[PDB]
Amino acid sequence: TRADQIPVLKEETQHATVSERVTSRFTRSHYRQFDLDQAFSAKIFDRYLNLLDYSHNVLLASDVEQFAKKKTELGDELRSGKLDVFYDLYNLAQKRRFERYQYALSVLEKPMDFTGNDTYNLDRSKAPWPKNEAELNALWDSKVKFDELSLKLTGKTDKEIRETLTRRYKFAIRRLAQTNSEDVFSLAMTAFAREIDPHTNYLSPRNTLEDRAVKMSVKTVGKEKVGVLDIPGFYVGLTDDVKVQLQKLEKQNVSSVIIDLRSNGGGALTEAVSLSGLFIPAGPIVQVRDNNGKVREDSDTDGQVFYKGPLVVLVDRFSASASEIFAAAMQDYGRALVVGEPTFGKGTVQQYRSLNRIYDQMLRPEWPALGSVQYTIQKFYRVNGGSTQRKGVTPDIIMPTGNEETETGEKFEDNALPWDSIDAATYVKSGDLTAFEPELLKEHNARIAKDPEFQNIMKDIARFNAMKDKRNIVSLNYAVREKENNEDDATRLARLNERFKREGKPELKKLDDLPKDYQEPDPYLDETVNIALDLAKLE
Amino acid sequence: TRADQIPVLKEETQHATVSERVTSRFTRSHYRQFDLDQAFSAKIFDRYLNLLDYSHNVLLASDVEQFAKKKTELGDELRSGKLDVFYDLYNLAQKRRFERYQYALSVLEKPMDFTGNDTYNLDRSKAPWPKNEAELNALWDSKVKFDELSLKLTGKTDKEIRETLTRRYKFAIRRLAQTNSEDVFSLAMTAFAREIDPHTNYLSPRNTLEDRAVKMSVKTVGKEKVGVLDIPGFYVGLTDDVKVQLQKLEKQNVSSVIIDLRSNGGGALTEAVSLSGLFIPAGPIVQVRDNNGKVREDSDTDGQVFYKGPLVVLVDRFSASASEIFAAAMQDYGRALVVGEPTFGKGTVQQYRSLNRIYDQMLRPEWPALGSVQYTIQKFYRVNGGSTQRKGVTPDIIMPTGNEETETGEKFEDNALPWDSIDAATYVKSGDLTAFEPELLKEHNARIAKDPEFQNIMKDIARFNAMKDKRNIVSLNYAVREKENNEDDATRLARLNERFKREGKPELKKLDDLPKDYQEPDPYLDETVNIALDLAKLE
Amino acid sequence: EVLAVPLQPTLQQEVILARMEQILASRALTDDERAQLLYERGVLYDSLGLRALARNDFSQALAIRPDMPEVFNYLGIYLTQAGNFDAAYEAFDSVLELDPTYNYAHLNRGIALYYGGRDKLAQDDLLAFYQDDPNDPFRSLWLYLAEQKLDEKQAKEVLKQHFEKSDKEQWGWNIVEFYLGNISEQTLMERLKADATDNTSLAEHLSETNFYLGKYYLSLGDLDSATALFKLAVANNVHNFVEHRYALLELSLLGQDQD
Amino acid sequence: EVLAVPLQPTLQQEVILARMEQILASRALTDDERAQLLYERGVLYDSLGLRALARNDFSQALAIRPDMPEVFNYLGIYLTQAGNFDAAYEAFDSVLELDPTYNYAHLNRGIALYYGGRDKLAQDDLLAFYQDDPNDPFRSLWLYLAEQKLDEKQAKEVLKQHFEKSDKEQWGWNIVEFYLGNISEQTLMERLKADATDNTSLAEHLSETNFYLGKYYLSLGDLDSATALFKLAVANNVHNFVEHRYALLELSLLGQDQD
């Protein structure tokens, strides 16, 4: 591509229909009751710009102010399938992006000088759009500098930086004239979808097993054992696999069991009710609620308790969906103790439906296969009546990282549904741990105040914290960005060596000697094994 | 047969069942609601004797008084099918009849002398049974004398009387040892049936068209014509045939029409409603009433009148069933005048049902075909609400024989159902003849007082009447029974000759010259033709 | 009022019809078992209120095996529903000739003779059926209806005995107790609510009790209350209850008084 | 009370089923006409209350010719009866994509959205269906029910207009007049008796009027009178009247409050 020989993208025959079908389902059958009015179509516009120009880099402010005149019209376009503003706004900026990469190549030839006091703001997600071509060219000068500098700091000659950043920018141009009419369609439907809730999606038509199983282990403190179940996800027939392993562990006289659901991001709700059932006799696990107003109770029907021994549940900020059900049930029945970070807050069920009707091959046989949509149909509620959503399971024992406010969680996703409560279900608590908790905590706090790995974690936190202003403001000075890397490498080598002398291992002469496959310690697991034994002691 | 080598008759396997089936239908589904109690089974006994020994001739009084001890048991025999009294009482008298015909032959050899003053009573229907064998032999002496005498009076030699009365009596013995088990069964079921009503019947299993149509004619008085329809019976599609002939007669400018239903003994009720319809526009013809309590109206649906001309209906004591419906309708609507004798009084419908069930060939395949039963299900009522039964249609103009009390009519049949009335139907009279009737009668009476054929009829009546005491008391004196025949022959020849001199025909020298196929005059038809014209004159 | 949801075709009922509809189109069957299934389906059709289609399957059963008393049972009932008591009698006779212990033929023939004006003959049958199970309160009730036509005074004394000498367990005796004057209609319905469990049970209780209350008021000559109660009895669609069938016949004889 | 004899399967209905049952077993048929008859029989099955067996014949129709909007109509209705409004919406969309003048899809989709908590979307459909025939009083009634949920005051003024500007001829406007407060329920039923001719007509009048009286009392929060009136509406077995179907659904949501 040397010029504007980028194909002009047009809406395909099928698309008008496919749009009408998407709009029908979103506007009628979504848990979220919204009006596709002017306010909504205006918000669908701003999201759509943020999908074309993420960093506010490619379009003129005048490009934006011109199309913006026409943003309350998007609800009409979607309902009718005439997506002219979506196709026009994409076509321009198909041009603008071309003419930014043809400029970025020109600038790569100029002399490189990394000795200024300029910074670079990584977050133009909310910046004003460039007012004119001089400001456009300035934002793209910064960008080829940042691209050059980040490469230079991997020890590259000015010569091989131009050779690699040409490869990149020239491929950015090929990507650009290889996009198709469905690409633009997909992104219009995505702006719509993602303005309802963060889990709603359009899914384009298709173009021309035991690795994720339960691992069990045992870990000792003196003469006493603790079984640990690493559960990677709620895969179908999980409850069968842990039943095998709960027998292996029952016999080996283990004092306590840990279910490890860290970074376990969900799976089959049924595996969550069946697993809950291994630990509590009978009772309701979860209240599900539908788009129209109606509640339902999943229960555990086999009234037998496959393991009555002391139980502990290890979760982090990435424990989600089904994991939060399970963890929430054990907490609510006081069947098991919860340790780690507050969980994600995924309190909602999404359903796939096809945009394909049985009479399509019949009437419009020229057409291709049509897409499918994914959208929220149900919410989850705990047996105590509260919702999983945007609150998550909060641990009985919160590791230090959980007291720190993080930027990861359903709560931080755009237009995530709010937090709700319905009435509690009828259930009888299998036990009560309010009794043991302040003592488990006395011990926990005493232990980690000494542990140097938890000292290292609580130092990491003070750092991450104190350097959150400059969070998205990177220096463009090679010296300062060479020194920054050396002080990171140096603090890492010191940590690794502080550790190796505790352990009677040889110290490392340099960071590069560390095996590629070195395993870090798991201080969170190691401290929970102690919590598990403390609990066993107290019953 | 020379002795008691008459087969002893036994009840067949099928019969017990067939009896139970007959009893079921009679006791439950008959218009007549009766109890098959002791009184009923006693009456079934007396009827059964009258069927074995009509003339009280064959059994001893002791034969009767012995079995009579057991007559309240017949209801049990019928309900169960154990018909031992019926089979015993038949078997004896199968013997008694044999031994009366073997005695009657002996007596035929003795000398014949017809010069006594002995009479012979033709009606022993209610006589006491013979008290001993001397009285038995006496009743059978009388009987061979009566048989001999009635033959002698056809000019037979004492020699050829013995040859013919041997033929007869010897064949009476062969009949007697050729009867079968079904014969006795049939007669038991008949005693039962005929004790309910005179039209109810058992019908034994089978052992190893335009002649009866309407004839039309015309008959004149001076220059004026009268159409006459001779209707022999209500055969299916009668109403089609009279429609042809009503067109033939309408065109030939006939002043009046006569329907002739004398001795027309019924047929399809539907042909009675359709024929009624030719003469009245629309309206109900007959109210039918069922065994359970429920009334129904047959009507004429085609509202057109195929003939509005003056109508007359000629009936006698043998006009019955459907004829009485038709005649009763025309009378009630004042559509037509009724002439003749009061009709029979058949105010009831009988139905055939088979005693055969579909599983018989299956289970009892040795059996033969089984019989059928016929029984009353419905009554008829006139549109004025009165019943046809035992009252009949009474003529507006009654011929002389109708003022005389006759011994023929439903009224005289045994256990004929009584006379009833329900409410009248809703109908509008097509006319009214109470106006014309006393004048039609002035004329009628004047005319027949002169007519010598009606003088002859009214002399016949005075005779039939004055000789009703001696009605069933025949002289056994040859002289008196030779003279009786000569005076009958002489009075007949005088009538025929009185007639032939009125007519300008040659007189007969003796009764024997009269052609075999001589046609008598029809004075009743001839006088009704006049009534028909008198009616035409008065409208 | 005490009202149920009118009963509706259950999915079990609709599923079985569809299976049968095809087990009977596949010619893989004995005569004897093709005939057994055609009977089985008529009972299903009958239980849905589809009597014409059941009459059809039952006639197809007897054209194949005329040996079957159970089929003559239904043919006779329909003949009683239709007003044709003569033919009804014929059918039930067939039933007790093919199997004389087929007791429910006695009830059906007895009822049929009741509607057919033959009370004394009805009493014989209804008393045979009583004596087969004196604890079943409806056997007493049907006999009462048949007696109360000739002698009310006697019919009542006899019901009273039938009740006194029974164990007084099954619901139906409460209907009997109201006929006897022991309990008001107020109490009768209090006990109905109390005895009923689910809606299918409530409909069954109402089908029965509305027919007997119906017959009761008709005694007094209250055609209006009778009519209302027969309609309400039928309004539960308990299609194969004798009270349903005979509340319809009752209603039919009352839509033949006004005509 | 004003009560009819509950409607019963007519002999015409039972005869046609038996014919069809065999015209469809004889393989002498186009695909296009085998599909037309399977639809014709589902409408018959539906009219008898046999929705599962009709769903069966309608699915067999669309597996053969998926071109048919009429079949999607019923599939959607059943889906509305079953509580599954999402799938209902899908079916009615299909109907108006295959034939956009298929007006009765608007009523059925509008009702379906009504039971499915989407009032404003229901109003659009019910008003499209009103404007197709402003003289049909039930089109006004359904729109009223859908409006009276957000704004009773407005719903009433709009019904009043719909009534004023109509010719006020067809029976249904008497129901409308009682909703408006012009005539008592006393008078409403006087006029019902007066307008009804035979029993089939009386059942139809009662199916409708009991459902609308039912919905009315439920407004006031009188669950007991509502319940009685829905049951009495269903008690006429006018199986294929929207009021029948939706008096059952109403009754089903009231047998989910007490649980």
Numbering used by the authors:
A (entry chain B), B (entry chain B): 27 to 234, 248 to 578
C (entry chain A), D (entry chain A): 28 to 286
From the paper:
Prc (also named Tsp) is a member of the family of C-terminal processing proteases (CTPs) which features an embedded regulatory PDZ domain inserted into a serine protease domain. In Escherichia coli, Prc is involved in degrading abnormal proteins that are unfolded or partially folded and marked cotranslationally at the C terminus by an SsrA tag and that are exported to the periplasm through the Sec translocon. The activity of Prc strictly requires the PDZ domain, and the PDZ deletion completely abolishes the protease activity.
To assess the structural role of the PDZ domain and the hydrophobic sensor residues, which have been shown to be required for Prc activity, we also determined the crystal structures of Prc-ΔPDZ and Prc-L245A/L340G when both are in complex with NlpI. In both structures, helix h9 and the hinge region are disordered and invisible from the electron density map. Nevertheless, the structures of the bowl-like body of Prc-ΔPDZ and Prc-L245A/L340G, including the protease platform, are superimposable with the structure of the resting Prc-S452I/L252Y. The proteolytic active-site residues in Prc-ΔPDZ and Prc-L245A/L340G are also in the misaligned resting-state conformation. These structures confirm that, without the PDZ domain or the hydrophobic substrate sensor, Prc is maintained in the inactive resting state. In contrast, Prc-ΔPDZ, Prc-L252Y, and Prc-L245A/L340G all failed to process sFtsI.
